[PDB]
Design a protein around this ligand. Structure first.
Ligand SMILES: OC[C@H]1O[C@H](OC[C@H]2O[C@H](O)[C@H](O)[C@@H](O)[C@@H]2O)[C@H](O)[C@@H](O)[C@@H]1O
Length: 812
């Protein structure tokens, strides 16, 4: 094996420095910014790659001028605002320190880069206290330290708690030394976080180029912000995507879709999306509504739309040989992935429809061809897709025949991990071209780093196939799977609520597991119930008790829409997921590294779902601050402690941090059932003299205008003093969008005693009964008054949403 060995020279060209080492080997450092360093180690010195990065869309992160290299007798030095880079000459060793001279990231001995006949590996020093997170949508515990992980998009139905690889390959991880690494290589990469030794960790590839980005941060937020500078801001879904979604393996016909739509509304179980699974299409993949299953597809879509339902249909990336017309067409055009052994279209087995041709989404001409096909259901009013089986399916590591696939942009060993990525990119690009200035809804199974630009994600075929009732640990592991997905830039994520796998032979017996799964699931942004085949899993299938609990769970998510939607926008701006591992907000608290049974939803809410069978309590870790039971709003706990709370089947443990302001809307059956509505702000005042706030974000919810920063914002602020609370409704920030109106705001201040008075500016407000304050809340926008609820310990102040600054002073 080949190492870099001694560095004999360097050359600078703009923001790039190239170090020449032994036997034509070279290594480049490129300062994308003061915090982000692109590193390219090369065994032969050439700096070429078969394909430029599929993930990176910007290398200019604001570095000004040349890189300055200071040569010393045995080292070179490069300084930035945040980094001190030390390069050993003999042998070459890259060492990155922070500005306090603490070592962050160092080559291990002389083996920082190792080439072994095309196999490329990077070895770094590993410290005893160094922990690791990320690598995208992967199983096991959040903390990756001690384990090894592989990138090969795989199709492993009913997967276990530690199964790896899974469906998506996002080679971005973060260290608790507060740097991220993105390994910009699409081959079957492997990450070994002290699984071989305590002295080093490694990342490697069997072929391709050793290109990776070192991303400094003072916290994890800063690292993630740097990663989206490189790989793109997440697109936001249409606003209605944050409601509840329903699917089934057999959701493939008109009469059923109409019946299901009617059942949700009759039962007052809120729901926005009805999915249709792959049987909807006549053949793979013609996008024609199956004749025996749909009589009037346009009328169906329109009638569901009038009921507030949006439809999302499946697509696979293959053309069945039995679909002779479309197969012959694709094959004649050269649009199918070839077999290197024959020069002809690769003959791919598939689980339905027979052998198929794999569509080559890396061939440029395929994009418009596919776009015209997929547009058909969209012309009927369908609002988007779920892109399934893009691994490609049935192409796990052991299916070595697949390595003979030759795609336009490369061989399968390179392209496998971006097969689904490039497909999903075509789907979104073509949607944009055919449906201008509209947000796509795409939710995908298979993906690569950078997917956030084109698609959302679900975690595929989860749960227990042998016995559905024994899926508790698998359900529980969807928490860190989702949180890790979030850290890999899948902010808009869900899992199959109820799991995918396992026949439901006994609905009474499955009720408890279904309820707990849905309680967790409604805190995923794209909450979707789904199950294999004809295993119905609508929230009324498990008896009245489970139905009532499930309706309440869904209702809570809908009430939280304005809160969740604000965090949807924060995902676009910062890269932060809605579902946040506590470590992202409390990086100084090492206890957070172990938390696989709870998470934050935005910053203000801590959710701790019960994920153990028979459990009627929950152990919850509370980080810094004081924390209030969000279910009753009375019980308060001190932070930095483990507690045990009561958590029977009808309860989801949810906590709100003291200081929080939570925007909520009324219960509706779908997002924008009421196009205008009063907004309530639940205010839990912080400690004496501490100013807290929430910035309520609004936009049109449908167009791409938000990408050009067309929106409005209303900042609500709270500051408690000695026997006085000041609530400020900030002047509306208008950036080209104005909200639904006219409407009222209701400030709901949680407090132990009725106050003496409430003022709006200098004017004293009339105290009124709750019924008066509530009367004509959607009809009269000239009333300013306040009420007191002794039972709930809430001061309610009604105020028209004028868009003007107002200071509300509560006198205790
Ligand atoms: O009609 C074919 C097939 O349709 C459903 O399954 C599609 C299935 O594909 C992957 O496993 C995804 O990960 C799942 O979310 C999809 O539901 C039915 O479940 C099946 O019974 C049927 O044969």
């Amino acid at each position: 094996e080949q190492y870099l060995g001694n560095c004999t020279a360097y050359s600078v060209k703009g923001n790039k420095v190239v170090f020449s080492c032994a036997n034509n080997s070279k290594i480049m450092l490129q300062l994308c910014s003061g915090e982000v360093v692109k590193i390219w180690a090369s065994a032969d010195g050439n700096f070429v790659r078969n394909n430029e990065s599929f993930a990176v869309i910007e290398e200019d992160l604001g570095w000004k001028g040349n890189v300055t290299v200071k040569e010393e007798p045995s080292t070179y030095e490069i300084f930035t605002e945040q980094l001190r880079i030390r390069v050993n000459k003999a042998p070459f060793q890259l060492q990155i320190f922070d500005k306090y001279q603490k070592l962050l990231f160092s080559d291990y001995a002389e083996k920082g880069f190792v080439n072994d006949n095309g196999k490329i590996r990077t070895n770094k020093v590993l410290r005893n206290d160094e922990q690791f997170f990320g690598l995208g949508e992967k199983s096991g515990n959040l903390n990756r330290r001690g384990s090894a992980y592989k990138m090969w998009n795989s199709d492993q139905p009913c997967y276990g708690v530690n199964e790896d690889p899974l469906y998506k390959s996002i080679p971005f991880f973060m260290s608790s030394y507060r740097y991220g690494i993105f390994f910009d290589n699409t081959y079957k990469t492997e990450f070994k976080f002290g699984s071989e030794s305590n002295d080093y960790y490694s990342f490697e590839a069997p072929a391709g180029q050793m290109v990776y980005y070192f991303m400094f941060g003072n916290d994890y937020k800063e690292i993630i912000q740097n990663y989206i500078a490189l790989t793109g801001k997440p697109i936001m879904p249409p606003k209605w995507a944050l409601g509840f979604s329903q699917c089934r393996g057999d959701y493939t016909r008109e009469d059923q879709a109409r019946e299901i739509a009617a059942e949700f509304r009759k039962r007052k179980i809120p729901c926005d999306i009805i999915y249709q699974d792959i049987g909807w299409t006549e053949g793979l993949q013609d996008f024609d509504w199956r004749k025996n299953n749909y009589n009037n597809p346009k009328g169906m879509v329109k009638d569901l739309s009038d009921m507030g339902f949006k439809m999302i249909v499946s697509q696979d990336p293959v053309i069945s040989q039995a679909n002779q017309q479309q197969w012959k067409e694709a094959d004649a055009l050269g649009h199918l992935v070839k077999d290197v052994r024959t020069g002809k279209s690769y003959d791919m087995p598939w689980p339905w429809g027979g052998n198929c041709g794999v569509v080559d989404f890396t061939k440029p001409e395929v994009a418009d061809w596919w776009g015209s096909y997929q547009q058909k259901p969209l012309n009927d009013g369908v609002r988007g897709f779920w892109t399934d089986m893009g691994e490609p399916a049935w192409s796990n590591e052991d299916a070595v025949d697949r390595l003979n696939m030759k795609h336009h942009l490369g061989m399968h060993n390179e392209i496998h991990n971006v097969y689904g990525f490039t497909w999903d990119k075509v789907v979104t690009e073509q949607f944009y071209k055919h449906n201008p200035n509209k947000r796509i809804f795409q939710m995908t199974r298979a993906a690569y780093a950078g997917l956030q630009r084109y698609t959302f994600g679900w975690s595929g075929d989860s749960g227990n196939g042998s016995n559905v009732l024994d899926g508790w640990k698998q359900m529980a592991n969807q928490i860190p799977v989702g949180l890790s997905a979030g850290m890999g830039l899948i902010p808009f994520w869900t899992c199959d609520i109820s799991g995918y796998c396992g026949d439901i032979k006994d609905y009474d017996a499955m009720a408890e597991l279904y309820v707990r799964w849905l309680q967790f699931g409604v805190f995923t942004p794209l909450s979707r119930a789904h199950h294999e085949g004809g295993n119905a899993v609508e929230p009324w299938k498990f008896g009245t008790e489970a139905e009532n609990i499930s309706r309440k769970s869904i209702e809570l998510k809908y009430k939280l829409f304005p809160y969740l939607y604000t965090y949807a926008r924060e995902a676009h701006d910062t890269g932060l997921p809605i579902m946040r591992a506590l470590l992202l907000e409390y990086p100084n608290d090492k206890e957070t590294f172990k938390l696989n049974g709870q998470f934050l939803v935005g910053k203000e809410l801590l959710v701790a779902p019960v994920v153990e069978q028979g459990a009627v309590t929950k152990d919850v870790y509370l980080p810094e601050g004081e924390w209030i039971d969000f279910n009753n709003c009375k019980t308060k706990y001190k932070g930095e402690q483990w507690i045990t709370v009561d958590a029977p089947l009808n309860t989801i443990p949810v906590f709100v941090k003291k200081g929080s302001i939570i925007p909520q809307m009324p219960v509706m059956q779908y997002i924008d059932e009421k196009k205008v509505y009063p907004v309530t702000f639940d205010i839990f005042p912080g400690n004496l003299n501490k100013e807290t706030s929430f910035t309520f974000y609004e936009d049109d919810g449908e167009s791409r205008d938000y990408e050009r920063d067309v929106f409005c914002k209303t900042k609500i602020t709270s500051k408690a003093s000695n026997e006085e609370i000041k609530i400020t409704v900030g002047e509306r920030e208008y950036k080209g969008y104005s909200p639904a109106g006219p409407r009222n705001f209701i400030l709901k201040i949680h407090a132990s005693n009725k106050p003496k008075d409430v003022f709006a500016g200098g004017e004293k407000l009339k105290n009124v009964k709750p019924h008066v304050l509530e009367k004509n809340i959607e009809a009269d926008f000239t009333k300013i008054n306040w009420s007191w609820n002794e039972a709930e310990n809430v001061i309610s102040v009604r105020i028209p949403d004028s868009g003007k600054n107002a200071v509300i002073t509560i006198k205790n």
